[PDB]
Short mmCIF file of C-alpha atoms and ligand atoms in Angstrom, two decimals:
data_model
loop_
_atom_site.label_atom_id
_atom_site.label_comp_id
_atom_site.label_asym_id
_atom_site.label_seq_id
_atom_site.Cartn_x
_atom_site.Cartn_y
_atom_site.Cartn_z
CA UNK N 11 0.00 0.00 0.00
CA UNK N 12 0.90 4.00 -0.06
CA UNK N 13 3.29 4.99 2.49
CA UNK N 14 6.45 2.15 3.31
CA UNK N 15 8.30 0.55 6.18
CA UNK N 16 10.87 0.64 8.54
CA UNK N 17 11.01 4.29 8.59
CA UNK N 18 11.63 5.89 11.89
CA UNK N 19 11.35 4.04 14.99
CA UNK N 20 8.37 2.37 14.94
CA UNK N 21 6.52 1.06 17.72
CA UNK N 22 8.65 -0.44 20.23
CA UNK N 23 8.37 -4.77 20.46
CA UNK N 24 5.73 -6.02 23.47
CA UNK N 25 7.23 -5.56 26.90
CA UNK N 26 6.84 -8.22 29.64
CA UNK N 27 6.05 -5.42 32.14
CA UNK N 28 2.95 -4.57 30.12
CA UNK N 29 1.23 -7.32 29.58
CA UNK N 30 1.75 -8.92 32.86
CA UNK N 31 1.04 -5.59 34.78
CA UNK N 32 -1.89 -5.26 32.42
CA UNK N 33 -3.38 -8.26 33.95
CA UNK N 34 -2.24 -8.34 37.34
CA UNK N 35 -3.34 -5.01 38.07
CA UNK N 36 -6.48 -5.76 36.60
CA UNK N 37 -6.76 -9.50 38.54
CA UNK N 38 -5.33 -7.68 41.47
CA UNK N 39 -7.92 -4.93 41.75
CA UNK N 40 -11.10 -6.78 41.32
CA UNK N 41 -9.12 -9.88 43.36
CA UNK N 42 -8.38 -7.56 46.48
CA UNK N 43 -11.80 -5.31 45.43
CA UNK N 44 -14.30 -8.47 45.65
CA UNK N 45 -13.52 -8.86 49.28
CA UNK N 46 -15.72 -5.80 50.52
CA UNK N 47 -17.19 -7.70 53.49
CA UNK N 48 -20.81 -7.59 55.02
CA UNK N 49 -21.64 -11.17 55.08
CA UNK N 50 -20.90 -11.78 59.03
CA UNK N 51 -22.93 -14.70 60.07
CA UNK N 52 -21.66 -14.02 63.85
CA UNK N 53 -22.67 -17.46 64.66
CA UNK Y 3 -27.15 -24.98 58.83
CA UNK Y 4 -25.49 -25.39 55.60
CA UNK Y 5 -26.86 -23.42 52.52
CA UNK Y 6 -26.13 -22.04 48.94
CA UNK Y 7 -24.61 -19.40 50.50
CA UNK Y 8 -23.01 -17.97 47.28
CA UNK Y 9 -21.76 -14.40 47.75
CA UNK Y 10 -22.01 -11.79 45.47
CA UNK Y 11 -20.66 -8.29 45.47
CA UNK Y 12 -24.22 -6.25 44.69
CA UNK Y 13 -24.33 -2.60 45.08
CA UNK Y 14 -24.15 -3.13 48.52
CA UNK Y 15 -20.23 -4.73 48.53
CA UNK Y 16 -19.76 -2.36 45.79
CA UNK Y 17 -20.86 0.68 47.19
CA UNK Y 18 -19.04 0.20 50.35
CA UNK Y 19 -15.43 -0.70 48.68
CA UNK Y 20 -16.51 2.47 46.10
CA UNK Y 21 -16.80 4.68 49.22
CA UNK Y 22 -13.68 3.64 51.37
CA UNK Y 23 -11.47 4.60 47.85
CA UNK Y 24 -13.84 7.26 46.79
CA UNK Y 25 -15.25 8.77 50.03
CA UNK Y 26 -15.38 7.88 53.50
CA UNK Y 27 -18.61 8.24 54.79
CA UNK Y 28 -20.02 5.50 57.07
CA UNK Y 29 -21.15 3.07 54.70
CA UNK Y 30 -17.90 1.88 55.04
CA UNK Y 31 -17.33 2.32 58.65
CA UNK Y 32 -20.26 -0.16 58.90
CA UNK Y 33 -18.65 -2.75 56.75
CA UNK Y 34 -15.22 -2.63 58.78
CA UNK Y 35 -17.62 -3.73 62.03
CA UNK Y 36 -18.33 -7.29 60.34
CA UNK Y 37 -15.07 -7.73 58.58
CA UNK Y 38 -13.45 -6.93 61.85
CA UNK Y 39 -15.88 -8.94 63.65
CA UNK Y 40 -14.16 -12.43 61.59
CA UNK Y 41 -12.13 -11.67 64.06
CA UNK Y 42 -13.70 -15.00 66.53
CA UNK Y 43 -15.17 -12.30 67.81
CA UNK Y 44 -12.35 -9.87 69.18
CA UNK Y 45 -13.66 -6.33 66.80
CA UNK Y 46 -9.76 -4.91 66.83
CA UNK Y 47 -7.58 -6.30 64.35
CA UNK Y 48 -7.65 -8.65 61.38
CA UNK Y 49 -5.15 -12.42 61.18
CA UNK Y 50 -5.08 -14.45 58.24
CA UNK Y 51 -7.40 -16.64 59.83
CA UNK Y 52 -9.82 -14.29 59.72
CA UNK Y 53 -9.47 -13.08 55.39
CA UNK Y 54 -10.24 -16.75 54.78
CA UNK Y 55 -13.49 -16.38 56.58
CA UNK Y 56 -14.17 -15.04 52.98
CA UNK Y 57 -15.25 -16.60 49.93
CA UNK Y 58 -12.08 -14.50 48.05
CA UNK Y 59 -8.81 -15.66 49.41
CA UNK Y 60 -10.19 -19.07 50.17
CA UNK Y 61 -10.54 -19.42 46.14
CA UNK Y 62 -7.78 -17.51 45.12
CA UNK Y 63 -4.85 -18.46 43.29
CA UNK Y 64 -2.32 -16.29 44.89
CA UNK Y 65 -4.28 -14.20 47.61
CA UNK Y 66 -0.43 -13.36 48.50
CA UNK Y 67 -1.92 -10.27 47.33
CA UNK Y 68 -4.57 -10.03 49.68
CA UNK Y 69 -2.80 -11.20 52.92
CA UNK Y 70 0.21 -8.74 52.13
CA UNK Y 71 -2.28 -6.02 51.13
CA UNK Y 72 -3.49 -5.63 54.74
CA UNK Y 73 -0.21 -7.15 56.56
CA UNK Y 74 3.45 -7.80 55.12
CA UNK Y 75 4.68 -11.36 56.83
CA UNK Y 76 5.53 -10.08 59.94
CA UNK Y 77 2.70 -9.12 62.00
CA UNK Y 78 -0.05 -11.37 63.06
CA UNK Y 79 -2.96 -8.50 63.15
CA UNK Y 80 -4.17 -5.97 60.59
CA UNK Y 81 -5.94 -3.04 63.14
CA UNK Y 82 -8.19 -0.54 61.29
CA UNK Y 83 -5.62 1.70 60.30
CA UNK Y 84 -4.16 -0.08 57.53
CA UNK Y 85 -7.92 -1.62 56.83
CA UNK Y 86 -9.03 1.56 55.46
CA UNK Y 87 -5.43 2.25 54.09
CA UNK Y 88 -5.61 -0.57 51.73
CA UNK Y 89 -9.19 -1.20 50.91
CA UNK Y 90 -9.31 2.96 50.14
CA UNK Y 91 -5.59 2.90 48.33
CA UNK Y 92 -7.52 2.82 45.24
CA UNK Y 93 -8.61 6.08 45.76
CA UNK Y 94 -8.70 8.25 41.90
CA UNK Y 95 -5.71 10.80 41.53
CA UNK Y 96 -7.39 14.16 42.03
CA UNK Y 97 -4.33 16.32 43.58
CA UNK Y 98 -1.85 15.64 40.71
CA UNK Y 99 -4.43 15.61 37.81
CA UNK Y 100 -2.68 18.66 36.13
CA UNK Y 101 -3.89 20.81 39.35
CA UNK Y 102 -1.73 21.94 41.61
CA UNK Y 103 -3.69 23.61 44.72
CA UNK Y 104 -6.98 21.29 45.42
CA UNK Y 105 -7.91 21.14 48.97
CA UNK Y 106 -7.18 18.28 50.86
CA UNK Y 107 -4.12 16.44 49.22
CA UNK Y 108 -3.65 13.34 51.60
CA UNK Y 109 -0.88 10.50 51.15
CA UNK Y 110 -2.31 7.64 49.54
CA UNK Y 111 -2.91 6.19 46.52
CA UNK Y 112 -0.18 8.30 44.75
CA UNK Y 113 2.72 7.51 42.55
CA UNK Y 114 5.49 6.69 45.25
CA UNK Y 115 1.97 4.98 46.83
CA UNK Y 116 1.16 2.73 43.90
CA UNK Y 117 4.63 1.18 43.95
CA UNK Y 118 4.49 0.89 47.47
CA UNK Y 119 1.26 -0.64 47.04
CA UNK Y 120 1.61 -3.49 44.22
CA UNK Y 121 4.71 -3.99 45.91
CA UNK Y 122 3.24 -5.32 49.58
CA UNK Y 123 1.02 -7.46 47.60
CA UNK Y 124 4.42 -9.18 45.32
CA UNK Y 125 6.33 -8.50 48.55
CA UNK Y 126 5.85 -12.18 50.36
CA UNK Y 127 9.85 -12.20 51.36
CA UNK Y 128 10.53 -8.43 51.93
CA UNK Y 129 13.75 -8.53 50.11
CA UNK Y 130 12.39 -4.92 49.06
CA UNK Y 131 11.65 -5.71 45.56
CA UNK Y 132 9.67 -9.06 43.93
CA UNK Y 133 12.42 -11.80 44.02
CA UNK Y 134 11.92 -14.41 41.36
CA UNK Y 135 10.18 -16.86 43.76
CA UNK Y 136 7.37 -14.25 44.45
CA UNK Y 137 7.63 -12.96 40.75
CA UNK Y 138 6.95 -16.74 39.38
CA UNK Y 139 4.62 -17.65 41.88
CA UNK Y 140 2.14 -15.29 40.05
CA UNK Y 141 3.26 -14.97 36.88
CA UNK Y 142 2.91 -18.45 35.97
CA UNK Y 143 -0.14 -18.70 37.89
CA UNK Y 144 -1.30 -15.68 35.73
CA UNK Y 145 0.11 -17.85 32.15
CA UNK Y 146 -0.06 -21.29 33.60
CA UNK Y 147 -3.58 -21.49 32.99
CA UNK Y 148 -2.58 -22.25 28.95
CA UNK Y 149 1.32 -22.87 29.11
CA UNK Y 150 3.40 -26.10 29.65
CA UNK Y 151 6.09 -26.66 32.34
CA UNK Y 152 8.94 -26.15 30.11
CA UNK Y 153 7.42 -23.45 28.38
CA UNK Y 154 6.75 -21.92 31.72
CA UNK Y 155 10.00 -22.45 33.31
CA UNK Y 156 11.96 -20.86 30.29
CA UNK Y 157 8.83 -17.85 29.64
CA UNK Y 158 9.50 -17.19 33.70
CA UNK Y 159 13.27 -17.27 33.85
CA UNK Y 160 13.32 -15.01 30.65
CA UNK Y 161 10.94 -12.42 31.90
CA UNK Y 162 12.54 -11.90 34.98
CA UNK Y 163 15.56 -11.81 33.23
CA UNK Y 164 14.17 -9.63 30.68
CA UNK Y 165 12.84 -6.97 32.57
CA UNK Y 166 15.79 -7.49 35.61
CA UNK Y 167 16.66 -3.51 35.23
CA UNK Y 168 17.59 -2.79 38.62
CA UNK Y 169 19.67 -5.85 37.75
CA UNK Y 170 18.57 -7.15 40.70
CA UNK Y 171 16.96 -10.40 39.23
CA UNK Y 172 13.79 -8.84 41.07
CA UNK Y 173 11.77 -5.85 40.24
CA UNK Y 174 9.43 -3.66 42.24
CA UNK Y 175 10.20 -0.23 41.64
CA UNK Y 176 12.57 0.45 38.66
CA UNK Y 177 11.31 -0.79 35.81
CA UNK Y 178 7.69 -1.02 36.91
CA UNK Y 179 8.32 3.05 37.32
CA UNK Y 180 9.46 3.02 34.28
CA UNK Y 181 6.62 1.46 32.86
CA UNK Y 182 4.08 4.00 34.52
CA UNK Y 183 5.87 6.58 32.25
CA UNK Y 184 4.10 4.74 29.38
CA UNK Y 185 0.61 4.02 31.61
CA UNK Y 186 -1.00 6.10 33.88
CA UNK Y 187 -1.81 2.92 35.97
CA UNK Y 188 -1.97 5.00 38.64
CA UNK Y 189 -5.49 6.18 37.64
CA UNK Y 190 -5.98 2.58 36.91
CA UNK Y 191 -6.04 1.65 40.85
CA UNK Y 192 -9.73 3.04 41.10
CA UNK Y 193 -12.84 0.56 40.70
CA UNK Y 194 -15.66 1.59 39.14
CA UNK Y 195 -17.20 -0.41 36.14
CA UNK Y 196 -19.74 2.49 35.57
CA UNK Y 197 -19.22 3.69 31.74
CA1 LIG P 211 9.88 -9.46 47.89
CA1 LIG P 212 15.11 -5.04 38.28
#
């Protein structure tokens, strides 16, 4: 197509630091978030 | 007796949580009375005896998140101090969001915070940064779920070894700061699921 390829410094490769924060701090959010509470039987 | 149980976090769970990171009204204070009351019944402090009285770590697959998140592995008893300080550490950035005079900027939940804060939860040994045990303990219970042994072994030694920047075979801090100056995951920290 039109324009060409590798120009400039394209995009840099996937990082291992994304995609596993990307997940962890999304798992770790809602993991840590889904505690909340209010379910005490006191028995 | 026995039931269906099944727990669910409705707009009540929700609500609460949403308060204690975006407010602090008593809605929350409320919910600290029963979660602090797992504790056999003393109302003071939290052990890890108690978190498993909940549906969430007991059917988690690390949970080291959740029992460093209130407590590193050194104390035996989270009080209410750091119960609000991690359950509201997810509080929105609203003090460094471009502004610079709001009117109540208080510690938590900011940059230095969010290391601080990812970090108890990777932070099992306290060597001050995630060694590779802690590192591969999640990681390949985050990839596992689809990847072999050997392909796990060799995708968990290289990504330590990949992203090792503080050369420490262990990361934490360095390159994970590094990698907010590509994310702003520090907004991220914030639940919400509204739009
Ligand atoms: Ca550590
Ligand atoms: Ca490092």
């Amino acid at each position: 197509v039109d324009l060409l390829a590798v120009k400039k410094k394209q995009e840099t490769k996937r990082s291992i630091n994304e995609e596993i924060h990307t997940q962890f701090l999304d798992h770790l959010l809602t993991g840590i978030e889904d505690i909340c509470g209010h379910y005490g039987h006191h028995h | 007796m026995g039931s269906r149980a099944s727990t669910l976090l409705r707009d009540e769970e929700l609500e609460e949580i949403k308060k204690e990171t975006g407010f602090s009204h008593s809605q929350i204070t409320r919910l600290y009375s029963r979660f602090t009351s797992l504790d056999k019944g003393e109302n003071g402090t939290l052990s890890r005896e108690d978190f498993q009285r909940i549906p969430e770590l007991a059917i988690n697959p690390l949970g080291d998140r959740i029992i460093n998140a209130f407590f590193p592995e050194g104390e035996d008893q989270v009080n209410f101090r750091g119960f609000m300080r991690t359950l509201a550490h997810f509080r929105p950035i609203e003090d460094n969001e471009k502004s610079k005079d709001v009117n109540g900027p208080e510690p938590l939940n900011s940059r230095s915070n969010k290391l601080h804060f990812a970090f108890r939860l990777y932070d099992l040994d306290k060597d001050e940064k995630i060694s590779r045990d802690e590192l591969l303990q999640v990681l390949r219970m985050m990839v596992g779920v689809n990847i072999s042994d050997e392909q796990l072994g060799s995708i968990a030694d290289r990504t330590i070894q990949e992203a090792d920047q503080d050369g420490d075979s262990a990361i934490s801090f360095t390159e994970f700061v590094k990698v907010l100056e590509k994310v702003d995951v520090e907004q991220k920290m914030s639940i919400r699921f509204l739009h």
